[PDB]
Amino acid sequence: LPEDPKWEFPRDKLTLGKPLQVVMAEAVGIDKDKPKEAVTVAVKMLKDDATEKDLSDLVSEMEMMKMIGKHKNIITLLGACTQDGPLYVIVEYASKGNLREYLRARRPEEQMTFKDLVSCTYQLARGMEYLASQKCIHRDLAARNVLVTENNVMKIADFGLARDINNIDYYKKTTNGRLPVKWMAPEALFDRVYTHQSDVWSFGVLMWEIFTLGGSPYPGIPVEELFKLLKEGHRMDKPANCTNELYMMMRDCWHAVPSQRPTFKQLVEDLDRILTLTTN
Template identity: 40%
Template sequence: MNKKQDISLHYFSDSSASYVQPNTQMSGSTGQPSITQTEWSMLISDGPLLTPMDMPPRRKLEYILDPKELQNFAVQIARGMTHLEQKQITHRDLAARNVLINERKILKISDFGLSRSGVYVNTKRKKVPLRWLSVEAMRENFYSSKSDVWAFAIVLWEIGTLGGFPYPTVSDMDLLNFLDEGKRLEKPDNCSDELYTLMLQCWSKTPDMRPSFAEIVSHLDSVICRKRVYVDFTSLKPNYSFPPTEQQTEVTTNPKQSK
Protein backbone atom coordinates (compact mmCIF):
# COMPACT_ATOMS: atom_id res chain seq x y z
CA MET A 1 0.00 0.00 0.00
CA ASN A 2 1.30 3.48 -0.83
CA LYS A 3 2.53 5.92 1.76
CA LYS A 4 -0.29 7.34 3.85
CA GLN A 5 -1.37 10.90 3.30
CA ASP A 6 -3.47 13.20 5.43
CA ILE A 7 -6.93 13.31 3.95
CA SER A 8 -9.84 15.51 4.91
CA LEU A 9 -13.23 15.68 3.26
CA HIS A 10 -15.13 18.58 1.73
CA TYR A 11 -18.84 18.36 2.50
CA PHE A 12 -21.72 19.39 0.28
CA SER A 13 -25.06 20.71 1.47
CA ASP A 14 -26.92 19.91 -1.73
CA SER A 15 -28.97 16.82 -2.60
CA SER A 16 -25.87 14.72 -3.36
CA ALA A 17 -25.32 13.97 0.32
CA SER A 18 -24.23 10.40 -0.45
CA TYR A 19 -21.08 11.72 -2.09
CA VAL A 20 -18.28 13.89 -0.70
CA GLN A 21 -15.12 15.28 -2.21
CA PRO A 22 -11.66 14.34 -0.88
CA ASN A 23 -9.52 17.33 0.07
CA THR A 24 -5.80 17.18 0.81
CA GLN A 25 -6.02 20.37 2.91
CA MET A 26 -7.80 20.49 6.23
CA SER A 27 -10.80 22.81 6.19
CA GLY A 28 -12.78 24.42 8.94
CA SER A 29 -16.15 23.34 7.65
CA THR A 30 -18.42 21.25 9.79
CA GLY A 31 -20.14 18.18 8.46
CA GLN A 32 -23.87 17.67 8.73
CA PRO A 33 -25.63 14.31 8.85
CA SER A 34 -26.54 13.04 5.42
CA ILE A 35 -30.23 12.66 4.62
CA THR A 36 -31.53 9.66 2.78
CA GLN A 37 -33.30 10.30 -0.50
CA THR A 38 -35.31 7.09 -0.37
CA GLU A 39 -38.97 7.11 0.61
CA TRP A 40 -40.08 5.47 3.82
CA SER A 41 -42.51 2.76 2.86
CA MET A 42 -44.49 -0.08 4.35
CA LEU A 43 -45.56 -3.36 2.77
CA ILE A 44 -49.25 -4.18 2.61
CA SER A 45 -51.15 -7.13 1.22
CA ASP A 46 -52.97 -5.27 -1.56
CA GLY A 47 -51.85 -2.26 -3.55
CA PRO A 48 -48.53 -0.46 -4.04
CA LEU A 49 -45.94 0.55 -1.48
CA LEU A 50 -47.22 3.45 0.60
CA THR A 51 -45.52 6.05 2.71
CA PRO A 52 -46.39 6.15 6.45
CA MET A 53 -48.61 9.20 5.86
CA ASP A 54 -50.72 7.16 3.42
CA MET A 55 -50.84 4.02 5.53
CA PRO A 56 -54.33 3.13 6.84
CA PRO A 57 -54.42 2.78 10.65
CA ARG A 58 -54.10 -0.70 12.18
CA ARG A 59 -53.51 -2.34 8.81
CA LYS A 60 -51.97 -5.79 9.06
CA LEU A 61 -48.50 -6.08 7.55
CA GLU A 62 -48.14 -8.78 4.93
CA TYR A 63 -44.85 -9.90 3.44
CA ILE A 64 -44.90 -9.89 -0.34
CA LEU A 65 -41.15 -10.30 -0.89
CA ASP A 66 -39.66 -13.77 -1.09
CA PRO A 67 -36.53 -14.02 1.13
CA LYS A 68 -35.04 -16.48 -1.37
CA GLU A 69 -35.45 -13.83 -4.05
CA LEU A 70 -33.42 -11.34 -2.02
CA GLN A 71 -30.72 -13.97 -1.51
CA ASN A 72 -30.67 -14.54 -5.24
CA PHE A 73 -30.15 -10.80 -5.75
CA ALA A 74 -27.16 -10.89 -3.41
CA VAL A 75 -25.65 -13.84 -5.27
CA GLN A 76 -26.15 -12.18 -8.66
CA ILE A 77 -24.36 -9.03 -7.47
CA ALA A 78 -21.53 -11.08 -5.98
CA ARG A 79 -21.11 -13.02 -9.25
CA GLY A 80 -20.99 -9.79 -11.23
CA MET A 81 -18.33 -8.43 -8.89
CA THR A 82 -16.40 -11.72 -9.18
CA HIS A 83 -16.20 -11.09 -12.92
CA LEU A 84 -14.77 -7.61 -12.28
CA GLU A 85 -12.40 -9.04 -9.70
CA GLN A 86 -11.09 -11.54 -12.25
CA LYS A 87 -10.67 -8.74 -14.79
CA GLN A 88 -8.81 -6.71 -12.13
CA ILE A 89 -11.30 -3.86 -12.34
CA THR A 90 -12.09 -1.84 -9.22
CA HIS A 91 -15.65 -0.49 -9.38
CA ARG A 92 -15.32 2.11 -6.55
CA ASP A 93 -19.06 2.92 -6.52
CA LEU A 94 -20.85 -0.34 -5.74
CA ALA A 95 -24.19 0.45 -4.09
CA ALA A 96 -27.79 -0.71 -4.40
CA ARG A 97 -28.61 2.44 -6.40
CA ASN A 98 -26.13 1.30 -9.07
CA VAL A 99 -27.65 -2.14 -9.60
CA LEU A 100 -30.22 -2.46 -12.39
CA ILE A 101 -32.96 -5.08 -12.57
CA ASN A 102 -35.09 -6.11 -15.54
CA GLU A 103 -38.54 -7.69 -15.80
CA ARG A 104 -36.95 -11.18 -15.50
CA LYS A 105 -35.32 -10.09 -12.22
CA ILE A 106 -31.85 -10.32 -13.69
CA LEU A 107 -29.49 -7.86 -12.00
CA LYS A 108 -26.75 -5.90 -13.73
CA ILE A 109 -24.07 -3.79 -12.06
CA SER A 110 -23.95 -0.32 -13.59
CA ASP A 111 -22.37 3.13 -13.27
CA PHE A 112 -18.70 2.53 -14.02
CA GLY A 113 -17.82 6.21 -14.00
CA LEU A 114 -15.46 5.77 -11.03
CA SER A 115 -14.10 2.34 -12.00
CA ARG A 116 -10.38 1.84 -12.61
CA SER A 117 -8.13 -0.98 -13.73
CA GLY A 118 -6.31 -2.69 -10.87
CA VAL A 119 -5.33 -1.10 -7.56
CA TYR A 120 -5.97 2.64 -7.63
CA VAL A 121 -4.92 5.63 -5.54
CA ASN A 122 -7.17 8.61 -6.13
CA THR A 123 -5.29 11.90 -6.07
CA LYS A 124 -7.93 14.03 -7.77
CA ARG A 125 -10.59 16.00 -6.00
CA LYS A 126 -13.75 14.24 -7.15
CA LYS A 127 -16.91 13.33 -5.31
CA VAL A 128 -16.85 9.84 -3.79
CA PRO A 129 -19.62 7.71 -2.17
CA LEU A 130 -18.40 8.18 1.42
CA ARG A 131 -20.81 5.85 3.23
CA TRP A 132 -19.92 2.92 0.98
CA LEU A 133 -16.15 3.42 1.27
CA SER A 134 -13.71 1.23 3.16
CA VAL A 135 -11.51 2.75 5.85
CA GLU A 136 -8.40 2.71 3.61
CA ALA A 137 -10.35 4.44 0.84
CA MET A 138 -11.48 7.16 3.25
CA ARG A 139 -8.09 7.69 4.87
CA GLU A 140 -5.66 7.08 2.01
CA ASN A 141 -7.80 7.24 -1.15
CA PHE A 142 -6.65 3.65 -1.76
CA TYR A 143 -9.02 1.42 -3.78
CA SER A 144 -8.88 -2.26 -4.72
CA SER A 145 -11.21 -5.24 -5.11
CA LYS A 146 -11.07 -5.48 -1.30
CA SER A 147 -12.60 -2.01 -0.97
CA ASP A 148 -15.33 -3.21 -3.35
CA VAL A 149 -15.87 -6.15 -0.99
CA TRP A 150 -16.47 -3.64 1.83
CA ALA A 151 -19.03 -1.85 -0.34
CA PHE A 152 -20.71 -5.17 -1.18
CA ALA A 153 -21.39 -5.74 2.51
CA ILE A 154 -23.04 -2.31 2.61
CA VAL A 155 -25.22 -3.50 -0.28
CA LEU A 156 -26.13 -6.61 1.73
CA TRP A 157 -27.14 -4.30 4.57
CA GLU A 158 -29.23 -2.24 2.12
CA ILE A 159 -30.96 -5.43 0.96
CA GLY A 160 -31.62 -6.50 4.54
CA THR A 161 -33.18 -3.15 5.41
CA LEU A 162 -34.94 -2.79 2.03
CA GLY A 163 -33.23 0.50 1.30
CA GLY A 164 -31.90 1.79 4.60
CA PHE A 165 -29.37 4.64 4.55
CA PRO A 166 -25.97 3.58 5.98
CA TYR A 167 -24.95 5.09 9.34
CA PRO A 168 -28.08 7.27 9.64
CA THR A 169 -27.09 8.62 13.08
CA VAL A 170 -23.43 9.37 12.18
CA SER A 171 -22.40 12.57 10.40
CA ASP A 172 -20.08 12.48 7.41
CA MET A 173 -17.37 14.23 9.39
CA ASP A 174 -17.49 11.64 12.20
CA LEU A 175 -17.74 8.52 10.06
CA LEU A 176 -14.02 7.68 9.78
CA ASN A 177 -13.50 7.99 13.54
CA PHE A 178 -16.62 5.87 14.06
CA LEU A 179 -15.12 3.07 11.92
CA ASP A 180 -11.63 3.45 13.36
CA GLU A 181 -13.11 2.76 16.79
CA GLY A 182 -14.21 -0.64 15.49
CA LYS A 183 -17.89 0.28 15.20
CA ARG A 184 -19.89 -1.00 12.26
CA LEU A 185 -23.46 -0.94 10.94
CA GLU A 186 -25.85 -2.74 13.26
CA LYS A 187 -27.37 -6.06 12.20
CA PRO A 188 -30.74 -5.54 10.49
CA ASP A 189 -33.57 -6.92 12.60
CA ASN A 190 -34.62 -9.39 9.90
CA CYS A 191 -31.08 -10.48 9.03
CA SER A 192 -29.61 -13.82 10.13
CA ASP A 193 -26.52 -14.01 12.33
CA GLU A 194 -24.78 -15.92 9.54
CA LEU A 195 -25.26 -13.13 7.02
CA TYR A 196 -24.20 -10.47 9.52
CA THR A 197 -21.04 -12.45 10.24
CA LEU A 198 -20.26 -12.31 6.52
CA MET A 199 -20.83 -8.55 6.56
CA LEU A 200 -18.42 -8.12 9.47
CA GLN A 201 -15.78 -10.15 7.64
CA CYS A 202 -16.18 -7.85 4.64
CA TRP A 203 -15.80 -4.85 6.97
CA SER A 204 -12.51 -6.02 8.41
CA LYS A 205 -10.16 -3.08 8.94
CA THR A 206 -7.37 -5.07 7.27
CA PRO A 207 -8.15 -5.52 3.54
CA ASP A 208 -6.36 -8.88 3.31
CA MET A 209 -8.67 -10.25 6.03
CA ARG A 210 -11.73 -9.68 3.83
CA PRO A 211 -12.98 -12.52 1.63
CA SER A 212 -12.68 -12.36 -2.14
CA PHE A 213 -15.83 -12.14 -4.25
CA ALA A 214 -15.22 -15.71 -5.43
CA GLU A 215 -15.26 -16.83 -1.79
CA ILE A 216 -18.40 -14.80 -1.13
CA VAL A 217 -20.19 -16.45 -4.06
CA SER A 218 -19.16 -19.89 -2.82
CA HIS A 219 -20.46 -19.08 0.65
CA LEU A 220 -23.78 -17.68 -0.57
CA ASP A 221 -24.30 -20.61 -2.94
CA SER A 222 -23.70 -23.07 -0.10
CA VAL A 223 -26.28 -21.27 2.02
CA ILE A 224 -28.86 -21.56 -0.74
CA CYS A 225 -28.06 -25.25 -1.16
CA ARG A 226 -28.58 -25.72 2.58
CA LYS A 227 -31.93 -23.90 2.21
CA ARG A 228 -30.99 -21.38 4.89
CA VAL A 229 -32.90 -18.09 5.01
CA TYR A 230 -30.75 -14.97 5.26
CA VAL A 231 -33.54 -12.40 5.44
CA ASP A 232 -36.66 -13.27 7.42
CA PHE A 233 -39.55 -10.80 7.56
CA THR A 234 -41.72 -12.95 9.84
CA SER A 235 -39.78 -11.82 12.92
CA LEU A 236 -40.66 -8.15 12.48
CA LYS A 237 -43.47 -6.31 14.24
CA PRO A 238 -46.53 -5.30 12.16
CA ASN A 239 -45.69 -1.58 12.43
CA TYR A 240 -42.13 -1.99 11.15
CA SER A 241 -41.38 0.28 8.19
CA PHE A 242 -38.89 -0.08 5.36
CA PRO A 243 -36.32 1.38 5.45
CA PRO A 244 -36.18 1.41 9.30
CA THR A 245 -37.02 4.76 10.85
CA GLU A 246 -34.52 6.75 12.89
CA GLN A 247 -36.32 5.70 16.07
CA GLN A 248 -35.99 2.02 15.13
CA THR A 249 -32.30 2.54 14.39
CA GLU A 250 -31.73 4.20 17.77
CA VAL A 251 -33.47 1.34 19.59
CA THR A 252 -31.30 -1.16 17.72
CA THR A 253 -28.15 0.80 18.55
CA ASN A 254 -29.18 1.49 22.15
CA PRO A 255 -31.31 -1.45 23.36
CA LYS A 256 -31.80 0.15 26.79
CA GLN A 257 -34.00 2.81 25.18
CA SER A 258 -36.54 0.18 24.25
CA LYS A 259 -37.23 -0.69 27.86
Protein backbone atom coordinates (compact mmCIF):
# COMPACT_ATOMS: atom_id res chain seq x y z
CA LEU A 1 0.00 0.00 0.00
CA PRO A 2 1.42 3.40 -1.15
CA GLU A 3 2.92 5.75 1.42
CA ASP A 4 1.00 9.03 1.71
CA PRO A 5 3.07 11.11 4.20
CA LYS A 6 0.44 13.85 4.10
CA TRP A 7 -2.07 11.62 5.90
CA GLU A 8 0.16 9.12 7.69
CA PHE A 9 -0.15 8.97 11.47
CA PRO A 10 2.21 7.16 13.92
CA ARG A 11 0.87 3.83 15.26
CA ASP A 12 2.67 4.31 18.58
CA LYS A 13 0.69 7.53 19.10
CA LEU A 14 -2.64 5.75 18.66
CA THR A 15 -4.29 3.85 21.51
CA LEU A 16 -7.24 1.67 20.51
CA GLY A 17 -10.30 1.63 22.74
CA LYS A 18 -13.80 0.18 23.12
CA PRO A 19 -16.10 -0.79 20.21
CA LEU A 20 -18.44 1.76 18.61
CA GLN A 21 -15.63 -2.32 12.29
CA VAL A 22 -15.11 0.88 14.26
CA VAL A 23 -13.46 1.46 17.63
CA MET A 24 -12.94 4.56 19.75
CA ALA A 25 -9.34 5.67 20.22
CA GLU A 26 -6.94 8.21 21.65
CA ALA A 27 -4.63 9.94 19.18
CA VAL A 28 -1.71 12.02 20.44
CA GLY A 29 -0.87 15.07 18.37
CA ILE A 30 -3.42 14.20 15.69
CA ASP A 31 -4.04 17.95 15.85
CA LYS A 32 -0.65 19.19 14.61
CA ASP A 33 -0.91 22.51 16.45
CA LYS A 34 -1.21 20.53 19.68
CA PRO A 35 1.65 17.96 19.37
CA LYS A 36 1.08 16.68 22.91
CA GLU A 37 -2.72 16.78 23.09
CA ALA A 38 -4.58 13.46 23.06
CA VAL A 39 -7.74 13.49 20.97
CA THR A 40 -10.64 11.07 21.14
CA VAL A 41 -11.23 9.67 17.68
CA ALA A 42 -12.87 6.80 15.86
CA VAL A 43 -10.84 4.18 14.03
CA LYS A 44 -12.13 1.95 11.27
CA MET A 45 -10.22 -1.28 10.63
CA LEU A 46 -10.78 -4.76 9.20
CA LYS A 47 -12.54 -7.51 11.14
CA ASP A 48 -10.62 -10.72 11.86
CA ASP A 49 -12.79 -12.51 9.27
CA ALA A 50 -12.52 -9.75 6.66
CA THR A 51 -12.61 -10.64 2.96
CA GLU A 52 -10.48 -9.22 0.14
CA LYS A 53 -13.39 -6.99 -0.91
CA ASP A 54 -13.63 -5.66 2.65
CA LEU A 55 -10.05 -4.55 2.28
CA SER A 56 -10.48 -2.74 -1.03
CA ASP A 57 -13.67 -1.14 0.32
CA LEU A 58 -11.78 0.27 3.31
CA VAL A 59 -8.97 1.52 1.07
CA SER A 60 -11.51 3.02 -1.31
CA GLU A 61 -13.29 4.65 1.63
CA MET A 62 -10.04 6.24 2.81
CA GLU A 63 -9.21 7.54 -0.66
CA MET A 64 -12.70 8.90 -1.31
CA MET A 65 -12.45 10.90 1.91
CA LYS A 66 -9.08 12.31 0.82
CA MET A 67 -10.50 13.36 -2.55
CA ILE A 68 -13.68 14.92 -1.14
CA GLY A 69 -11.99 17.45 1.11
CA LYS A 70 -13.23 18.86 4.40
CA HIS A 71 -16.74 20.20 4.99
CA LYS A 72 -18.79 21.03 8.08
CA ASN A 73 -21.38 18.33 7.38
CA ILE A 74 -19.06 15.52 6.36
CA ILE A 75 -17.30 13.39 8.95
CA THR A 76 -13.67 14.49 8.94
CA LEU A 77 -10.76 12.27 7.92
CA LEU A 78 -7.98 12.90 10.46
CA GLY A 79 -5.27 10.47 9.44
CA ALA A 80 -4.32 6.89 8.66
CA CYS A 81 -1.87 4.12 9.58
CA THR A 82 -1.12 2.37 6.28
CA GLN A 83 2.46 1.14 6.61
CA ASP A 84 3.93 -1.89 8.37
CA GLY A 85 0.70 -3.08 9.96
CA PRO A 86 -3.11 -3.30 9.72
CA LEU A 87 -4.91 -0.46 7.91
CA TYR A 88 -6.44 2.10 10.26
CA VAL A 89 -8.60 4.90 8.89
CA ILE A 90 -8.83 7.58 11.58
CA VAL A 91 -11.85 9.85 11.50
CA GLU A 92 -13.56 12.38 13.74
CA TYR A 93 -15.45 10.98 16.75
CA ALA A 94 -19.18 11.77 16.83
CA SER A 95 -20.36 11.48 20.42
CA LYS A 96 -24.09 11.29 19.68
CA GLY A 97 -24.00 8.14 17.53
CA ASN A 98 -25.73 7.72 14.17
CA LEU A 99 -28.80 9.73 13.18
CA ARG A 100 -31.23 6.80 13.15
CA GLU A 101 -30.51 5.93 16.80
CA TYR A 102 -30.34 9.59 17.81
CA LEU A 103 -33.84 10.26 16.42
CA ARG A 104 -35.49 7.20 17.97
CA ALA A 105 -33.84 8.13 21.27
CA ARG A 106 -35.77 11.40 21.46
CA ARG A 107 -39.14 10.04 20.31
CA PRO A 108 -42.20 11.45 22.13
CA GLU A 109 -34.18 12.23 25.88
CA GLU A 110 -34.92 15.80 24.71
CA GLN A 111 -37.63 15.72 22.00
CA MET A 112 -36.94 17.11 18.52
CA THR A 113 -38.70 20.32 17.43
CA PHE A 114 -40.03 20.70 13.89
CA LYS A 115 -37.27 23.27 13.31
CA ASP A 116 -34.63 20.82 14.59
CA LEU A 117 -35.74 18.29 12.00
CA VAL A 118 -35.54 20.96 9.29
CA SER A 119 -32.10 22.12 10.41
CA CYS A 120 -31.02 18.50 10.37
CA THR A 121 -32.29 18.12 6.80
CA TYR A 122 -30.76 21.43 5.74
CA GLN A 123 -27.34 20.49 7.08
CA LEU A 124 -27.40 17.19 5.20
CA ALA A 125 -28.45 18.82 1.94
CA ARG A 126 -25.46 21.19 2.25
CA GLY A 127 -23.10 18.25 2.72
CA MET A 128 -24.47 16.45 -0.34
CA GLU A 129 -24.38 19.63 -2.39
CA TYR A 130 -20.68 19.97 -1.56
CA LEU A 131 -20.12 16.25 -2.07
CA ALA A 132 -21.81 16.44 -5.45
CA SER A 133 -19.67 19.44 -6.44
CA GLN A 134 -16.58 17.34 -5.74
CA LYS A 135 -17.88 14.92 -8.38
CA CYS A 136 -18.62 12.23 -5.81
CA ILE A 137 -21.57 9.87 -5.52
CA HIS A 138 -22.21 8.47 -2.05
CA ARG A 139 -24.55 5.57 -2.96
CA ASP A 140 -25.32 4.64 0.64
CA LEU A 141 -27.15 7.66 2.02
CA ALA A 142 -29.33 6.70 5.03
CA ALA A 143 -29.93 7.86 8.61
CA ARG A 144 -27.75 4.96 9.79
CA ASN A 145 -24.89 6.53 7.78
CA VAL A 146 -25.21 9.98 9.32
CA LEU A 147 -23.31 10.77 12.49
CA VAL A 148 -24.18 13.49 14.99
CA THR A 149 -21.53 15.35 16.98
CA GLU A 150 -21.71 16.72 20.52
CA ASN A 151 -23.09 20.04 19.24
CA ASN A 152 -25.73 18.21 17.21
CA VAL A 153 -23.99 18.88 13.91
CA MET A 154 -25.04 16.51 11.14
CA LYS A 155 -22.23 14.64 9.41
CA ILE A 156 -22.55 12.34 6.42
CA ALA A 157 -20.46 9.22 7.02
CA ASP A 158 -19.60 5.67 5.91
CA PHE A 159 -18.04 6.27 2.49
CA GLY A 160 -17.65 2.51 2.10
CA LEU A 161 -19.54 2.53 -1.22
CA ALA A 162 -18.74 6.03 -2.51
CA ARG A 163 -17.28 6.49 -5.99
CA ASP A 164 -16.09 9.18 -8.38
CA ILE A 165 -18.97 9.86 -10.79
CA ASN A 166 -16.73 8.68 -13.63
CA ASN A 167 -15.78 5.35 -12.03
CA ILE A 168 -18.95 3.34 -12.72
CA ASP A 169 -19.32 0.23 -14.92
CA TYR A 170 -22.17 1.66 -17.00
CA TYR A 171 -24.80 -0.97 -17.87
CA LYS A 172 -22.96 -3.98 -16.40
CA LYS A 173 -25.22 -6.44 -14.53
CA THR A 174 -22.91 -6.46 -11.49
CA THR A 175 -23.04 -2.69 -10.94
CA ASN A 176 -24.93 -1.33 -7.90
CA GLY A 177 -25.55 -4.83 -6.55
CA ARG A 178 -24.50 -3.94 -3.01
CA LEU A 179 -26.69 -0.92 -2.32
CA PRO A 180 -29.50 -1.26 0.26
CA VAL A 181 -32.54 -1.72 -1.98
CA LYS A 182 -35.00 0.46 -0.02
CA TRP A 183 -32.81 3.59 -0.37
CA MET A 184 -31.99 2.87 -3.99
CA ALA A 185 -33.04 4.92 -7.03
CA PRO A 186 -34.93 2.76 -9.56
CA GLU A 187 -32.49 3.44 -12.41
CA ALA A 188 -29.67 2.14 -10.20
CA LEU A 189 -31.04 -1.38 -10.67
CA PHE A 190 -33.03 -1.30 -13.90
CA ASP A 191 -30.31 0.40 -15.95
CA ARG A 192 -27.19 -0.08 -13.82
CA VAL A 193 -26.27 3.61 -13.68
CA TYR A 194 -25.66 6.01 -10.82
CA THR A 195 -25.54 9.79 -11.00
CA HIS A 196 -25.95 12.63 -8.54
CA GLN A 197 -29.70 12.41 -9.18
CA SER A 198 -29.55 8.86 -7.86
CA ASP A 199 -28.20 10.22 -4.57
CA VAL A 200 -31.06 12.73 -4.30
CA TRP A 201 -33.57 9.86 -4.54
CA SER A 202 -31.85 8.38 -1.48
CA PHE A 203 -31.89 11.82 0.14
CA GLY A 204 -35.65 11.64 -0.23
CA VAL A 205 -35.78 8.38 1.74
CA LEU A 206 -33.44 9.97 4.29
CA MET A 207 -35.89 12.88 4.65
CA TRP A 208 -38.66 10.40 5.40
CA GLU A 209 -36.49 8.64 8.02
CA ILE A 210 -35.81 11.99 9.65
CA PHE A 211 -39.40 13.24 9.84
CA THR A 212 -40.68 9.87 11.06
CA LEU A 213 -37.94 10.07 13.68
CA GLY A 214 -35.96 7.09 12.49
CA GLY A 215 -38.82 5.07 11.03
CA SER A 216 -38.18 2.11 8.73
CA PRO A 217 -38.94 2.84 5.04
CA TYR A 218 -41.71 1.03 3.15
CA PRO A 219 -43.03 -0.57 6.37
CA GLY A 220 -44.44 -4.05 5.87
CA ILE A 221 -43.17 -4.30 2.31
CA PRO A 222 -40.41 -6.88 1.70
CA VAL A 223 -37.52 -5.84 -0.53
CA GLU A 224 -38.55 -8.67 -2.89
CA GLU A 225 -41.70 -6.91 -4.01
CA LEU A 226 -40.50 -3.33 -3.61
CA PHE A 227 -39.25 -2.79 -7.15
CA LYS A 228 -42.45 -3.99 -8.78
CA LEU A 229 -44.29 -1.46 -6.62
CA LEU A 230 -41.81 1.33 -7.34
CA LYS A 231 -42.23 0.59 -11.03
CA GLU A 232 -46.01 0.96 -10.69
CA GLY A 233 -45.58 4.35 -9.06
CA HIS A 234 -45.84 3.40 -5.38
CA ARG A 235 -44.34 5.97 -2.99
CA MET A 236 -44.33 6.23 0.81
CA ASP A 237 -47.13 8.25 2.39
CA LYS A 238 -46.56 11.55 4.16
CA PRO A 239 -45.05 11.34 7.65
CA ALA A 240 -47.38 12.79 10.29
CA ASN A 241 -45.92 15.84 12.00
CA CYS A 242 -44.36 16.83 8.69
CA THR A 243 -45.31 19.73 6.45
CA ASN A 244 -47.14 19.15 3.15
CA GLU A 245 -44.46 21.33 1.55
CA LEU A 246 -41.68 19.16 2.94
CA TYR A 247 -43.45 16.00 1.82
CA MET A 248 -43.75 17.50 -1.65
CA MET A 249 -39.98 17.95 -1.56
CA MET A 250 -39.66 14.25 -0.70
CA ARG A 251 -41.92 13.30 -3.61
CA ASP A 252 -39.87 15.56 -5.88
CA CYS A 253 -36.74 13.58 -4.92
CA TRP A 254 -38.62 10.40 -5.83
CA HIS A 255 -39.62 11.42 -9.35
CA ALA A 256 -39.45 8.45 -11.69
CA VAL A 257 -37.48 10.57 -14.14
CA PRO A 258 -33.98 11.27 -12.73
CA SER A 259 -33.49 14.62 -14.44
CA GLN A 260 -36.88 15.80 -13.10
CA ARG A 261 -35.64 15.48 -9.51
CA PRO A 262 -34.26 18.64 -7.93
CA THR A 263 -30.50 19.07 -7.64
CA PHE A 264 -28.82 19.24 -4.27
CA LYS A 265 -28.23 22.90 -5.06
CA GLN A 266 -31.96 23.57 -5.47
CA LEU A 267 -32.71 21.49 -2.35
CA VAL A 268 -30.38 23.57 -0.21
CA GLU A 269 -32.01 26.78 -1.45
CA ASP A 270 -35.53 25.55 -0.75
CA LEU A 271 -34.62 24.13 2.66
CA ASP A 272 -32.77 27.30 3.64
CA ARG A 273 -35.84 29.27 2.57
CA ILE A 274 -38.12 27.12 4.73
CA LEU A 275 -35.67 27.05 7.66
CA THR A 276 -35.40 30.84 7.73
CA LEU A 277 -39.19 31.20 7.76
CA THR A 278 -39.65 28.56 10.47
CA THR A 279 -37.08 30.36 12.65
CA ASN A 280 -38.62 33.81 12.07
